[PDB]
Every structure is written in structure tokens, then in C-alpha cells.
Amino acid sequence: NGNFVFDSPISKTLLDQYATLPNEFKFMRYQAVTCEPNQLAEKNFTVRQLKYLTPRETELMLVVTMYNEDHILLGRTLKGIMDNVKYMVKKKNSSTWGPDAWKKIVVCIISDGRSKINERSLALLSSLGCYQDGFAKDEINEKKVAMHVYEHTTMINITNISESEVSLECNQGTVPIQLLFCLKEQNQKKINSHRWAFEGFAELLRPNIVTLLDAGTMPGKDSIYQLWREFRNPNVGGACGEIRTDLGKRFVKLLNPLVASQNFEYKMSNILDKTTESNFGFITVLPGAFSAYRFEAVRGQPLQKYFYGEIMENEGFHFFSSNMYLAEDRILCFEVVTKKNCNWILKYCRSSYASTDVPERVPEFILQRRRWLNGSFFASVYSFCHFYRVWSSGHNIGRKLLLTVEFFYLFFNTLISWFSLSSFFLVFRILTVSIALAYHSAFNVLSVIFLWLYGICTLSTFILSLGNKPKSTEKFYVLTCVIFAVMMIYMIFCSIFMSVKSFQNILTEAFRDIVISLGSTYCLYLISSIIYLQPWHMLTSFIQYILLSPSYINVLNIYAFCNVHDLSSYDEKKTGYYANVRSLVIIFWVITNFIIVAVVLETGGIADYIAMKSISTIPLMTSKASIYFNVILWLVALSALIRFIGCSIYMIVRFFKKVT
Amino acid sequence: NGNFVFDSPISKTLLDQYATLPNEFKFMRYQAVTCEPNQLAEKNFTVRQLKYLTPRETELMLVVTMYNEDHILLGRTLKGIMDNVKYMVKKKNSSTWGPDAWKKIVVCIISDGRSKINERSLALLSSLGCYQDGFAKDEINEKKVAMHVYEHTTMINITNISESEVSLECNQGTVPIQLLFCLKEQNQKKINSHRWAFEGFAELLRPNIVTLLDAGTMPGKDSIYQLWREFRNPNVGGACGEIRTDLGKRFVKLLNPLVASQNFEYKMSNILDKTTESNFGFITVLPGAFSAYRFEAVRGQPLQKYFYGEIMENEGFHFFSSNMYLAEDRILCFEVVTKKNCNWILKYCRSSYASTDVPERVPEFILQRRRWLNGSFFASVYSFCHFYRVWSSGHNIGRKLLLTVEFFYLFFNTLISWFSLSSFFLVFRILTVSIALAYHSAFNVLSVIFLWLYGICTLSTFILSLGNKPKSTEKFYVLTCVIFAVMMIYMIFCSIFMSVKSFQNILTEAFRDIVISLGSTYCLYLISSIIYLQPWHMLTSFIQYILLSPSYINVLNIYAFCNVHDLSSYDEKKTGYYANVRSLVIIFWVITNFIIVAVVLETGGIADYIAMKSISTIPLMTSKASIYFNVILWLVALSALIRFIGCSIYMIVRFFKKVT
Ligand SMILES: NC(=O)OC[C@H](O)[C@@H](O)[C@H](N)C(=O)N[C@H](C(=O)O)[C@H]1O[C@@H](n2cc(CO)c(=O)[nH]c2=O)[C@H](O)[C@@H]1O
Ligand SMILES: NC(=O)OC[C@H](O)[C@@H](O)[C@H](N)C(=O)N[C@H](C(=O)O)[C@H]1O[C@@H](n2cc(CO)c(=O)[nH]c2=O)[C@H](O)[C@@H]1O
């Protein structure tokens, strides 16, 4: 049909394994694609699934993305998938998953560039019988090729994963898998790969559900099946399973403090936040590593906004229309909820889990968090600045009201997180000075030293994040984290010391109240973990996270706000606009935080002004500090309480549904 | 000789003008150079000057550098040169400059790249008969050409410069000029352009004196001749004239405040600093726009250090060995003074002047000053960190001692300038608070507002200089300068107000002393200007400079320290080292200044610590502020006094030499 195709018989050894035979098992198809993803249909590109005498009906289509992963991570992910399909076909009382479930299940593996792909994994892929060199063409009839499509259905299954080798076997218990290997001619953006999946192949495949995976992610032994079960309600359009750190063999990785704190964080985010948000019906972010979308729900407006942005735009740049790309993923969720005349919702099913690797060194950790913080902030402001769209959807009145209250709660979250830095120093200074004034022994020298340490660390972090890169200077970041850990240790010691002394004296008072409130939040965390029935997470070095806490409050935030856009003709004007908007958020951040600090501690000449106005007719401490300190933990207790109540509701309805 | 040469007869019209005739007048030589500058000799490249039957003896060789200048600036510079040579030949009583003195002089014009050269000026050059297209070759016998050499001796002289057109004429009063047009095949560093002059052509030309000019610089009607006269002393090896800001026709540019302040600065630097430094015998910097070097003195070690750097170096990077390039020009001066077994000195002759254009908009002004500030700081630290070399030279003991004391004085200059920012804010705060405490009327609100304004401006400048570029954001810099001008206005008003009130009361006291000292420095400036016999410069909007002063103290310095290296395999390691060293000077700067501010104003918890130590047994102001404020103007008066004394000595010896 004017296009280049090539069929090469499957490896004779692989054919012998298959024997251990209809045409699709014995051969590999190769197609060369030279168009952008949205011409696969009418430019006469096809797949085997439609070439049979009776076209195959796709019930699930699976996508995984590779950039440079070695064969271990990919092997693990496909081990999970093949196990899950084996359980799928093993089901008896399921028409969707009977003797030939894989007939309705095809797995697509989206590479990114031959140059950066790890041939170390191409070895395994060739072992599976879906990849052979020799017939790769970079340009066809003066048309540059866009992607290579390799297409085979194997019989070999992965069965064990050792730290070094990948165990594959072919027996009578194996289950056929339909493969779709796509190799982008050159390395491209992950969103482009998603477009190749959604805007492209999915259109021909006509799938009922599309699940986004990620190389190195472990589906549970039945997590995919459970996720599919969640879609029996005709209202859900997206869903996501709990994601936990893969830790290490015999939990060895749990030695690393960073891994320990990250583990506790992953657990919390999946115990309070997601259950609370899924109670209302809107989830802030579906993890890109593991998510599922009903295809018909997402087509149209969502993919438009995701791949193109707000088309309605003049020649000049606008804030949203040229900044929404930093919330690339989150916007999808928003767009499905408030679609016109459609009542789609999102759901969080806790019993489908996935274990993933995490960054292990400070540079990679920071370079990862940066994207997440920027995306979260931009998506939150975009959602709150356009919430009225929810009233233009097809929801009933109750859903609409619940979505409204949820939006207000989320904006309260983003605002309280915006002024976190000011509270951090404001609290530390108040407690340190309070105790030093109280007892006089040796906190006096300590107070001065700690203040200087915090100032130098805060400044140096600003300078380094604005000018330098994390890769060049790794030692200083580790030292900064250590210093913040020491400061947090001293803060806790002061708190407990004052609490004990005040208890003896009653045998100040607001600090007895603060220890009440801190005990309250810790006990509520414990109860929340107890309800979920995974209470060893609190024992997973949660204290290690507490020590690293200050770092996240005074290091991740500064870097995230100091590297907003990652800058490097129309291009120069765009770069100038990006640089201008980057250096304008930071100044606002510092000024707004310092306004609170000045109002409370009475620095910046305010004390001098007050004292000398009274002369017209300075103190060491005022009641303002006491009031502020009471208020901050008032708020912390409130947040913990509302989140605990939400978690209980989610678990209660989940259990009640199980009872029914 | 295995090389490509090409002779084309001079324009017939130009030939007719010449008639209005020996061979060198009637033809243009063209040579193609394909080696690096230090093979012009032994790779058999020659020039006409040596091709005559009796080789011509070069008494002066002149170099001018072009990057993109239009025909006006170049035309002005060559107008100056031809006038000066006309006066040179017009001289009667001289053993050297006779009727054929022009033959002993050759002018070399070093371009930089065909791509960026202004063909708008190539028009004028072709008019002069030293440039014709058609026979340009970019590569000769698989060897890339390095430079095009065009060679002619004209008879036309420039006679008037209108804002639009260049008046050229050919009459009986014109004087022949020997030209050497060297258009670099590709644009490159100006130092590389100089490398072609000194390490290259000069070796064949064997000149007695080489004068560095710059496109757009006006030699005086006799400045070149005077500069040559300065070399009759067999000890001088370099000398420089005096640069005057171009006020423009009827001082039209003067209206611009920036031009006015720059004019006053150019005058001062040439009235106190250079005369004082030339009294001892070492000049900090010979202006690249206008300078003169005795060739034999500079050959050897100086060009080695200038073009290559400290060869003695390991694989790793060292501070000096890889940072000296930022003081590219200044080092030359140092190297001539402390040459081994040579007693060369530098001299400053005031009566040779040169008028040049200056940057007129804030972005270009800042992008210019940056290089000067970085070069000055690095050269000063390099000189003071290696001063013992002076004792290894061939000077007598008296010269050696004078050079020692001068080096100490220069390091005192660089140190006092290093802690200028801290003094700026420290003084402003002390005066504003002092007055506000004094009188209570409305300085109270003003004091608080001014403090906040300074803080925001200082912060915003830090952020913008670290992250952004001056080109993108021009408006904010102008606003910053305006704000600093307003702050300086208020500072002056407070000073005079307190002085007047204290005078009435005596009809605090340290501030009566400060007004004494400020009157002292202003009157010493006036007397210094009076002695030099150019006292209209004080009337050239010197007050406009005073208003812009704060800006230079709190804007030029921050940008200079925040863009030290201009960063953008061995290259990546080098870039990492540059980025590391860049972000380490800044932190030192801030910490050292804030240490002074904390010690004096007693901020940073020091007051809290003192008060609560006394509790173990805070004020609004202490005597420390009074002591510091007295000391700072003590120092300012000292500097003004020593500089005035030096200026007088220079003028006295100059006059005495004239008397003798
Ligand atoms: N909560 C949660 O997300 O889990 C953690 C999450 O799994 C991470 O830990 C996980 N290691 C991870 O980074 N996955 C990436 C992602 O999808 O974001 C995958 O995208 C692919 N990719 C990415 C880029 C740069 O964006 C590219 O240029 N090309 C490209 O191909 C690549 O295959 C990468 O693996
Ligand atoms: N006190 C004092 O110096 O006077 C002020 C001084 O004259 C300035 O105002 C004067 N406008 C000026 O900038 N002259 C430059 C200089 O010599 O530094 C000349 O160097 C040339 N050049 C420069 C670069 C970049 O460095 C290049 O890449 N290529 C290149 O050819 C260029 O011809 C430029 O004109």
C-alpha cells in the first residue's frame, strides 16, 4: 500500500521452544512508520489483530516506556505482566478472562531512540523473539522513518529474577502473550510516546481500557485484574493502585536513611491523602508509573489539552496557555472530571499495589522532586483558578457540591504549604529564644550558634540552587541535610525539656498545649496506620524521615522554586519570557514569607519604630509569638483530624461494599 | 615560495587621484596567511617594507582593532592618524621625524572575521584603495587560510567628519601613508588579534615602538608625537595618554546623566590615580584604547604570560594558573616592571589626550563595567600575592622601596573597596536612625520605609544578576538606579539638616566632625582639579554622578561578583571548576560584609545574647555606631589627602622638567 513491511520467520530455536503451529507464532512482522501518530489509520498502517479472518477484540492494552533501563528492570516488569496474565486466564467464573484471556490483551513496549536504548535489554527482547537486527531502515523513499514496529506473539514466560540473570522458560503451563515492540527512530519526549499510544495505536486497536505502566514497576500478582474489576461501575474513567518502594532483598535497602524516609512518605501519601480525595471523587494525580484510563472517557478534550495546550491564544505569551505544560500529567485527571456533559469520576482501590525503585543519592532525589513540586503547584493553582468549570459538567448537585468543598480544601493545602518556610524558621527561633530566656544555663550560646548555622545554610542553598547544579556539588547537600537533622534534634530536645519542666512545675502553659497537640497528631498517625492494616511502615525508620524532614522543608522547596522552567527568533523571545517569569515567583515567595516573619517576631525596624513612637509620648519578646505558635499547631491538628476522618470513611465504605 | 600571492593595480580613479609614480603607489599586494602568527618569518611570508632595494626602517607601527564598527568611528580614527602624521612630517628640527618620517611609520588595521565586519566601512577602505573583492580564497591547497593581508600606500587624506559622511580629499598638501590591512578570515578574541600584531608582524617589521589604538579613539592633534617624545628616556617601556568622555557636538550627549557621571569619573581617574601611581613608577592599567610599548622591553616573558599563561602547571586546575586570564591586559604592565635584570618603568604624560565614545544605556554600561571590575580585582590580588618578584629585578634600592610602598597602598585600595557594600548600608542605617531618634517628627516612618526599599532593591539585584541577563530586563535596572538616587538625596538632606541644627545648638558633635571631613574631601577635589588646569569637569554634572554613585556601590559590584567567569570531557570538568569557583567568592563576600554589620549594629542575635547574659547577673543604639562612623570618614579623608599630595608632586616635577 505504498508502505514498507517485512516478515521474517521467528527464531528456529524459539520456534522449537514454541513447539515444546499457526502462522502468527512462527513469524515476526516489521513495519516502518514515517508519519506523526495521528495518521496510522488513514495512511493504511495496520496490525495483525485486525488482519485475522475475524478481527480480535482488545479488552486491555498495556503500555510500558523505556529510556535507558537495563534488562533487570524490564525483565521484572514483564515477569509481573506474564504472571498477571497467567492468573487472568486461570480464572474460571470470568467470561472476560476465560480459556484465552490474552486474545483480548496486547502489551505495547514504547522505546525511545536506538542510540540511548540499552542493548543490554535488547538482548532479552531478542530472546523473547520480538527483535532482530539487519533490517532497520532510517529513511524510506526520501521520507525519514519515524518508528520501527516489531510484532510477534511468544510462548516463553519469565519465572525468576536473580540480581544478575533473568530466568525464562517454555513449558506446558506458559500462556501466550501478544507483543507490540515500538522503537522511536530518535529519543523523544515521554508525552510524545504517550501520544504514539493514545492518539495513535489505540485508535486502530479500539481498546476498552488502557493502563499506563513504567519500566521497573511491579504489578501485584493480581493488581491488574483488581484494577480491571474496579471498572465495573459505569462511572469510573480512571483509577490508580497504591505504589510502594521496592526496598531491597531482605529489606537491605532499608539501611539507607533516604530510602527509609521515602518509604514512610510513600506509605502516608497512600494512607491519608488518596483515600480522602477518592472519598469525594477527584484525585489530584494518578501516578504515571501505574494508572488506568477508560479509553472512551478520555478521548477528545483531555488529549487535546494534554498534547497541545490551550489553542485559544494570541501571538503573545499568556500565563496559563504557556505554563500548563509543567503540570503535564495532572491536568489529565482534572480534564476527565469536568468534561462537558459527562459524569466521570476517579477511584482509588487500595488492594492493587505496585513496588518501584526510588532515587538513592541526593542529586538524583532532588532532580526528581523538582518536577513533582513544580507540577503539583502549577496544577493546584490551575485547578483552583478555573474551578467553575465543574458546574458546567453533567454531575448531579451533590457531586458538584462535594467537588467544590474538595477544591477549597486542596487550595488550603497548597496555600499552607506555600508559607511553610517562614513557619519553619519562625517556630525554631521562638522555641530556642523562649527556652534560653527561661533557663539561662547554656541554651544562650546554643541559640546564637543555631541562628547563624540556619542563616548560612539557607543562603548557601539559595546561591547554589540559583547558579550551580546538583551534580557538580554533592558533598555540600549532604552536609546541609546533616545540619538540618541536628537542628531538628535540638528542636525536639527543647520541646521535651520544656514539657517535662512545666509538668514538674504544675505538679509555659501554651507549650503544654503544644505537646498535647503533637501527641495528638502522632497518635492520629498511628491510628490511621492501624486501620489500614499495614502498621510496620511506622517502624520503617519513620524517625529517620523526621530527621530528614527539615531538609525537605528548606532544601527541596528552594531548589524547586529556583529551577522552575529549566531554561537554556521566537525561541529567544520564549526563553526571555521564561527567564522573566522564573525570577518573579522567587521574589514574591521571599517577600511574602518575610512579611509574616516581620509581623510576628517584630524585626525589620518595626520594634524600633514602635519603641520610638512610644518615646514620642525595645522588648525581647511579645505575646505575638505565643499566639502564632499556638495557631500553627492548631492548624496541624486540624489537618491531621480531617485527613483521619476521610481515611476512616474510605475504609468503612470499602468494607461495607465488601460486606455487600 | 609555495605560497599564494596576488598583485592587482590600484584603482585607476585612485591612480588619477595619486597623479593629482613609483610602483608601490600604483598596486595592491595580497597575501594569504595559513599559519598561526609565529611562523610569518620562517614560512617565507614577507612585506613590501623589506622588499625594497634598501629595506625601510620602521620607527613606529600602529595597530587598530575592528569588530563591527561603522565607517564613522573608523573614519574618525584614521582622520586623527593622518593629521598626526601630517604634523609629524611637518616638523623641521628633529633628527628622526624629517620629510620622509612617514615612511618610518606603518599603520596596521586588524579586522576580526569577514562575517561580522561592517561592509559599511569596507566601502571607505576600498575608497582608500586598500581593499578589493573578487580574489578572496578561504582555503589554499587543502590548507585553510588564516588571514588576508592587503597592502597599499595611499595619498588621500581625511579632512572633515560630519555626522553622516566622511570627507576625503587628494591634494598637494596630503602626506603618504603606509597601510597594512589584515582582515581575519574568521572572528576571534581581540587578544588573538594582538597576537597577530606582536608575536607576528612585528617580528618582521622590527619596530622601535608599538602603539595600541582602538577603533573610535581620537588621538590628539599631536598626542602620538608627544607619546613618542616620552620615550627619549631609555628607561621607559610603556606609556599611556588621557581618555576623555566624548561630550558630543555642543556637549549634546552631556544631557544624559550616565554620560555626565562617566565624564566626571574619567576625569578623576586621570587626575589623582594615574599621576599618583606614575610618581612611584608603576601604573595599574594602561588603557587598551590608547597605549604605547617599547618593543624590545616587552618581548619574552611578558608576551609569554599574556598569550599562554603560567605554563608550569599540573593536569589539575590551580587558582592563578587558570584564573589569570580575567586580568588579561593588566598583567602586561606588571610583567614589564618586574622583568628579570631589566629596570623598565611606566610613565603617564598628561598632555597627550584621546577622546572616546562610551556606553550610553544601562545594559551596555553594566556589561562593560563587569569586565573592568573583575580584571581589576584579579590583577590586584595577583600583584599583591606575588610582590616579592620586584626584589628579583634589576632596579636600584630606592625604586624597589618605592614599588613596595606603592604595592601596599594599592592593596589597601582593593581591600577598602572590597568592604564598600557593608559600609554603604551601615552608614545609611546609622544616619537615618540617629536623626529619627533625634527629632521624632516624620523621619520615623521615613526610616522604616527606606530600610525596606534598600532591602528589596539589594535582594532583587542579587536574584536578577544571578539568574537573568541585563538585556532582557532593562526597566528594572533604571528603576533601581532611580531609587538609589532618591536614597542618596535623603542621606544628603539628613546630613545637612543635622549639621545646621547642631551649629545652631552650639551657637551630635561627631557629625559636626563628619561635615568638616566631607567639606575637606570636596575642597581637596576642587583644589586637585584647579591644579591640573581643567576645572570645568567639576561643572560637568559631577552632582549627577553623586546621585548615580549609590548605584555603582550597590549594582555594578553585585553584578561583577555574580558573573565572574561567564560560563556556558575536559571542557565539562573546566566548566564545573569555573562554576564552583564562581559561587564561592560570592558567599565569602556576603559573609565578610555581614560580619562587620553584625559587629557594629549588633544584629544577628548579638544584642539578645548580651542582654540576656546581663539578665543572668536590648538598647536602641550604642557608641559603636559613633566610633565606626567617625572612622569611615577618617579613612576617606586620608585617601583624598594622600592622592592630592601625589597629584601635586606629579605636576611639580612635570613643571620643573618643563622649566629645565
Ligand atoms: N510516583 C511515581 O511516579 O513513581 C516513581 C517513578 O516510577 C520513577 O521512580 C521512575 N523511575 C521514572 O522516572 N519513570 C519515568 C516516568 O514515567 O516518569 C519513565 O519515563 C521514561 N522516560 C523518561 C524521560 C524523562 O522524563 C525521557 O526522556 N524518556 C523516557 O523514556 C523512562 O522509561 C522512565 O523510566
Ligand atoms: N578605557 C577604555 O578602554 O576606553 C573605552 C574603550 O575604548 C571602549 O569604550 C571601546 N568602545 C571598546 O570596547 N574597545 C574594544 C577593546 O579594545 O576593548 C575593541 O576591541 C575590539 N573587539 C572586541 C571584542 C570583545 O572583547 C571582540 O570580540 N572583538 C573585537 O574586535 C573591538 O574593535 C572593540 O572596539
Residue numbers in the entry:
A (entry chain B), B (entry chain A): 382 to 401, 409 to 895, 908 to 968, 1027 to 1075, 1087 to 1129
Quoted from the paper:
In this report, we determined seven cryo-electron microscopy (cryo-EM) structures of S. cerevisiae Chs1 in the apo state and in complex with UDP-GlcNAc, UDP-GlcNAc+GlcNAc, UDP, UDP+GlcNAc, PolyB, and NikkoZ. The overall structure of Chs1 reveals a dimer architecture with a twofold symmetry and is ~100 Å tall and 110 Å wide. Each Chs1 monomer is composed of a large cytosolic soluble region and a transmembrane domain (TMD), with both the N-terminus and C-terminus in the cytosol.
The nucleoside moieties of PolyB and NikkoZ are the same 5-aminohexuronic acid N-glycosidically bound to uracil. In contrast, the peptidyl moieties of PolyB contain carbamoylpolyoxamic acid, and NikkoZ contains hydroxypyridylhomothreonine. We determined the structures of Chs1-PolyB and the Chs1-NikkoZ complex at 3.6-Å and 2.4-Å resolution, respectively. Comparison between Chs1 maps in the apo and inhibitor-bound states revealed clearly elongated extra densities corresponding to PolyB and NikkoZ in the active site, consistent with their function as substrate competitive inhibitors. The nucleoside moieties of PolyB and NikkoZ are stabilized by T453, M454, Y455, and K578 at the top of the active site, which are the same residues interacting with the nucleoside group of UDP-GlcNAc. In contrast, unlike the flexible GlcNAc moiety of UDP-GlcNAc extending away from the active site, the peptidyl moieties of PolyB and NikkoZ extend toward the chitin transport channel and form extensive interactions with E457, D602, A677, and W760. The unique architecture of peptidyl moiety makes the inhibitor locked inside of the active site of Chs1. Besides, the switch loop of Chs1 is open in our Chs1-PolyB and Chs1-NikkoZ structures. Notably, end part of the peptidyl moieties of PolyB and NikkoZ occupy the GlcNAc acceptor binding site, and thus block the chitin transport channel. Therefore, our structures suggest that the peptidyl nucleoside inhibitors inhibit chitin synthases using a unique mechanism: the nucleoside moiety competes with UDP binding, and the peptidyl moiety induces the switch loop open and blocks the gate of chitin transport channel.
